[PDB]
Every structure is written in C-alpha cells, then in structure tokens.
Enzyme design. Structure first.
Site, mmCIF file in Angstrom:
data_model
loop_
_atom_site.group_PDB
_atom_site.id
_atom_site.type_symbol
_atom_site.label_atom_id
_atom_site.label_comp_id
_atom_site.label_asym_id
_atom_site.label_seq_id
_atom_site.Cartn_x
_atom_site.Cartn_y
_atom_site.Cartn_z
ATOM 1 C CD1 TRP A 50 0.543 -0.875 3.138
ATOM 2 C CD2 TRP A 50 0.166 1.334 3.200
ATOM 3 N NE1 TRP A 50 1.218 -0.363 4.219
ATOM 4 C CE2 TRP A 50 1.009 0.992 4.273
ATOM 5 C CE3 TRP A 50 -0.204 2.674 3.027
ATOM 6 C CZ2 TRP A 50 1.478 1.937 5.184
ATOM 7 C CZ3 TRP A 50 0.261 3.613 3.933
ATOM 8 C CH2 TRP A 50 1.101 3.241 4.994
ATOM 9 N N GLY A 77 9.331 -13.278 -6.656
ATOM 10 C CA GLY A 77 9.497 -13.799 -5.310
ATOM 11 C C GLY A 77 8.756 -15.108 -5.120
ATOM 12 C CD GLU A 119 11.401 -18.066 -5.321
ATOM 13 O OE1 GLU A 119 10.896 -19.083 -4.801
ATOM 14 O OE2 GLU A 119 11.933 -17.157 -4.637
HETATM 15 N N1 LIG Z 1 18.228 -12.831 -4.732
HETATM 16 C C1 LIG Z 1 17.160 -13.529 -4.247
HETATM 17 N N2 LIG Z 1 15.933 -13.403 -4.791
HETATM 18 N N3 LIG Z 1 15.121 -14.273 -4.054
HETATM 19 C C2 LIG Z 1 15.964 -14.798 -3.142
HETATM 20 N N4 LIG Z 1 15.554 -15.790 -2.174
HETATM 21 C C3 LIG Z 1 15.846 -15.352 -0.793
HETATM 22 C C4 LIG Z 1 15.599 -16.518 0.160
HETATM 23 C C5 LIG Z 1 14.134 -16.928 0.041
HETATM 24 N N5 LIG Z 1 13.780 -18.024 0.964
HETATM 25 C C6 LIG Z 1 14.008 -17.611 2.371
HETATM 26 C C7 LIG Z 1 13.253 -16.331 2.740
HETATM 27 C C8 LIG Z 1 13.263 -16.097 4.238
HETATM 28 C C9 LIG Z 1 14.456 -15.895 4.924
HETATM 29 C C10 LIG Z 1 14.438 -15.683 6.300
HETATM 30 C C11 LIG Z 1 13.231 -15.662 6.990
HETATM 31 CL CL1 LIG Z 1 13.209 -15.385 8.750
HETATM 32 C C12 LIG Z 1 12.037 -15.854 6.310
HETATM 33 C C13 LIG Z 1 12.059 -16.067 4.937
HETATM 34 C C14 LIG Z 1 12.360 -18.345 0.695
HETATM 35 C C15 LIG Z 1 11.762 -19.278 1.722
HETATM 36 C C16 LIG Z 1 11.926 -20.646 1.566
HETATM 37 C C17 LIG Z 1 11.369 -21.509 2.509
HETATM 38 C C18 LIG Z 1 10.439 -21.019 3.416
HETATM 39 C C19 LIG Z 1 10.059 -19.682 3.351
HETATM 40 C C20 LIG Z 1 10.632 -18.850 2.405
HETATM 41 C C21 LIG Z 1 13.847 -17.340 -1.403
HETATM 42 C C22 LIG Z 1 14.141 -16.179 -2.350
HETATM 43 N N6 LIG Z 1 17.244 -14.381 -3.206
#
Ligand SMILES: Nc1n[nH]c(N2CCC(N(CCc3ccc(Cl)cc3)Cc3ccccc3)CC2)n1
Length: 377
Positions: A50, A77, A119
């Site tokens: 928002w 994402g 993704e």
């Molecule tokens: N450059 C880049 N673009 N996107 C990413 N990644 C970053 C890490 C993300 N990955 C971790 C994200 C995440 C990290 C830390 C916390 Cl506390 C909460 C969520 C996704 C995830 C997978 C499993 C469960 C929940 C969420 C997946 C996307 N890196």
C-alpha cells in the site's frame, strides 16, 4: 567488486526493534540495492504494498547521499507464483506490454534497473516451454533497455536475475549461456539448500559437501552451485554469490542427537520477530542464550542447538570464508538476502550495526575510504 543487497517491503511490519524501513538503510553499505518485490497486473509491472510509492522515494533518495549507488526493482518472489510470468511470456504482445511498462515504471520511480525473480521458469507449475520463453524475455528486456538508452540519452537500465542453485531447477528453466550474455549480472541464490522440509538436519548454506554425501546431495552446496553456473556459461565477473543473513531451523527427534544429518520431526520453533517456523534471522540466532554453537568442519559453516532445536546459519567467520572463496573463483561479488535479517540496528548480537553485511563489504575491499563509522570484524 559488487555488493548487492536486498531490501524487503514487508520488513516494515515486524514488531519492536526488528521493524525495518528505508531510514534503517545505509546508503554506503552496498554498491547495489534491490527492492523486493514488485508484482504484475495485466502483464504490467505493479506495486505490491500500500505504501510502496512512499518507500520507493525514500529508497531511491538514498542516491542523493551516495550518487554512486545503483538501485533495482525485483519482480516476483516466492509467493508470487508462476502463472503471471507464464501468461506474460506466452506471446510477443504480452512481453512487449511488460517490457514497455517496466521501462516506464523504473524511470518514473527512479530505479536504475530490473531484477527478475521468477520462481521458477519450467518448475513449480510453469510449463517446459517457459525455459525458452524466459530466454526470450531476458533478450527482449536487454534489447529494449539498450534501445531506450540510445533514444533517451540516459544511462542504460540494468537487468539482473536471481537464479536457483539446484540442478533440477537450473535444467528445467535456464539456458544459462544464453541468458548470461544478456544479463548485467546473475544473483546466485546460494542458500535454501536444506531446511525443515527434509527429515534430517542440514545446513541452509554449506560451502562444500560433507564427506558422507553422495549422488545429487553432493551438489547441494555453494561451491557446486557456483561451479555449475560457471561451467554452464556464466562469465565469472557476472556471477554474484548469494549470502544469507538468516538460518534454517529444525525440531530434533531427540535432544541427544544434534549432529548434522540427525533425525528431525519438522520445523524449528518460530523466532520472536520473524514468526515463521523453520526460519530465523541472524539477530534471532546470534544471541541465543544457553545454546551450544558448533561448526560443520567439512562445510565451513556453523550450527547451534539448544534442547530439541537445531539451526544452521551463517556467521562472520563463514561470510569471511565465502568471500575468500568467491575471490579465488574470480566472481563479480556478493549478494545478500537480506538487509533486515542482519542485525541492522545492532540491537541483538553485540557486534555493532550490520555485522554480517559489513563483513562482506570489508572482505570485498569495498569499505569507503572516507568512511567514519564502520566496524571491522
Ligand atoms: N536474490 C534472491 N531473490 N530471491 C531470493 N531468495 C531469498 C531466500 C528466500 N527463501 C528464504 C526467505 C526467508 C528468509 C528468512 C526468513 Cl526469517 C524468512 C524467509 C524463501 C523461503 C523458503 C522456505 C520457506 C520460506 C521462504 C527465497 C528467495 N534471493
């Protein structure tokens, strides 16, 4: 060297000291800041929160303080799904709609580029044809950014992509050699290698394999992922090594077996701020009282346990090791997920502000020579 850091537009909703906004951003911490995430509406780039428009002004306003800083907007994402990407890349008309919308949107809000975070093409419900269509999308964007620079006389918009480390995803979606030619840099998501979806403990982001591992499991590490992307045709200078300022947690089947590979019954207890079982921010693990910290000798990364809770994470030492590694491989720099998961305010770890990301900056030899308030680790 580059230090590419992600800002997240939902960190503003965390409680207490964990709340993060653009004012907690340090304009000279990173070389590139990427804003996660934008979405898509009728094949056109769109906001997701928002107050994104307010935040965009503060975020890109950082460049007033550090004019060298580059910003990008990340689309997609892990909660975005695949269908909107699939529908947009399905026809030349829809791709043109998207590409033109992206140029207009980025220029309007003063972003220096676009980061693609689908993704993933060819996986998670996306059809196999999306592999070649992703290549086409990347080419369409690169070509149109080039043309807009020519016709406007402005500095060309940057194009990057966040790409997976796992061979199954890579092979299903990514014509590595083709897309690498059109991307300015490649953000390798060298994390989420293991986690609570698996029946045994394993580290979020190990640098190397464990001696015990074999088969496909032996490629679930940073070194294998880097070599995979290099060998498949990414120029080393374009490959940017992802670094996690978070860890992944497990509930152990028994508190008496805390090894890597010990049986687990599910996700670790949610953290007090991030409130998401299976995940913890660095600031939620760095100061864990009465816990026992260990290192995985083969994999060069720490874990920590207390009672039936086990967490694999990254610390200052593992970040140093990984930067030494990326420099040996000649990579273009480091990328970090995410600003708001490091101890950005220095409230938890007794290591000052941004201890993990300052460690990256330091080891990459990117500390501003005129810097006053940095902290070496
Ligand atoms: N450059 C880049 N673009 N996107 C990413 N990644 C970053 C890490 C993300 N990955 C971790 C994200 C995440 C990290 C830390 C916390 Cl506390 C909460 C969520 C996704 C995830 C997978 C499993 C469960 C929940 C969420 C997946 C996307 N890196």
């Amino acid at each position: 060297a580059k230090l590419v850091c992600y800002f997240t537009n939902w960190a503003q909703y965390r409680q207490g000291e964990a709340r993060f906004l653009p004012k907690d951003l340090d304009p000279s911490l990173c070389t590139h800041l990427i804003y996660a995430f934008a979405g898509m509406t009728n094949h056109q780039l769109s906001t997701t929160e928002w107050n994104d428009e307010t935040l965009y002004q503060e975020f890109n306003g950082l460049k007033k303080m550090n004019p060298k800083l580059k910003t990008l907007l990340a689309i997609g994402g892990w909660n975005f799904g695949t269908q909107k990407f699939t529908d947009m890349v399905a026809t030349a008309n829809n791709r043109q709609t998207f590409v033109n919308s992206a140029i207009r949107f980025l220029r309007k809000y003063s972003f220096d580029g676009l980061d693609l975070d689908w993704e993933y093409p060819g996986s998670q419900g996306s059809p196999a044809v999306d592999k070649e269509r992703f290549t086409t999308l990347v080419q369409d964007l690169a070509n149109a950014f080039q043309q807009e620079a020519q016709t406007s006389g402005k500095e060309r918009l940057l194009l990057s992509a966040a790409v997976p480390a796992g061979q199954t995803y890579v092979d299903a979606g990514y014509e590595v050699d083709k897309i690498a030619q059109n991307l300015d840099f490649v953000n390798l998501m060298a994390y989420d290698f293991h986690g609570s979806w698996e029946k045994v403990t394993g580290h979020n982001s190990p640098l190397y394999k464990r001696q015990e591992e074999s088969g496909a499991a032996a490629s679930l590490n940073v070194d294998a992922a880097v070599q995979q992307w290099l060998q498949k045709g990414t120029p080393a200078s374009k490959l940017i090594l992802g670094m996690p300022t978070y860890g992944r947690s497990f509930t152990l089947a028994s508190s008496s077996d805390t090894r890597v590979g010990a049986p687990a019954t599910g996700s670790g207890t949610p953290g007090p701020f991030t409130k998401e079982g299976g995940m913890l921010a660095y600031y939620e693990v760095c100061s864990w009282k009465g816990a026992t910290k260990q290192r995985i000798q083969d994999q060069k990364v720490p874990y920590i346990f207390r009672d039936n809770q086990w967490v694999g994470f990254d610390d200052v030492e593992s970040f140093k090791t990984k930067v030494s590694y990326l420099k040996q491989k000649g990579l273009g720099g480091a990328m970090v997920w995410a600003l708001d998961l490091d101890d950005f305010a220095g409230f938890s770890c007794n290591q000052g502000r941004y201890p993990l990301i300052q460690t990256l900056r330091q080891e990459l030899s990117l500390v501003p020579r005129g810097s006053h308030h940095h902290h070496h680790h």
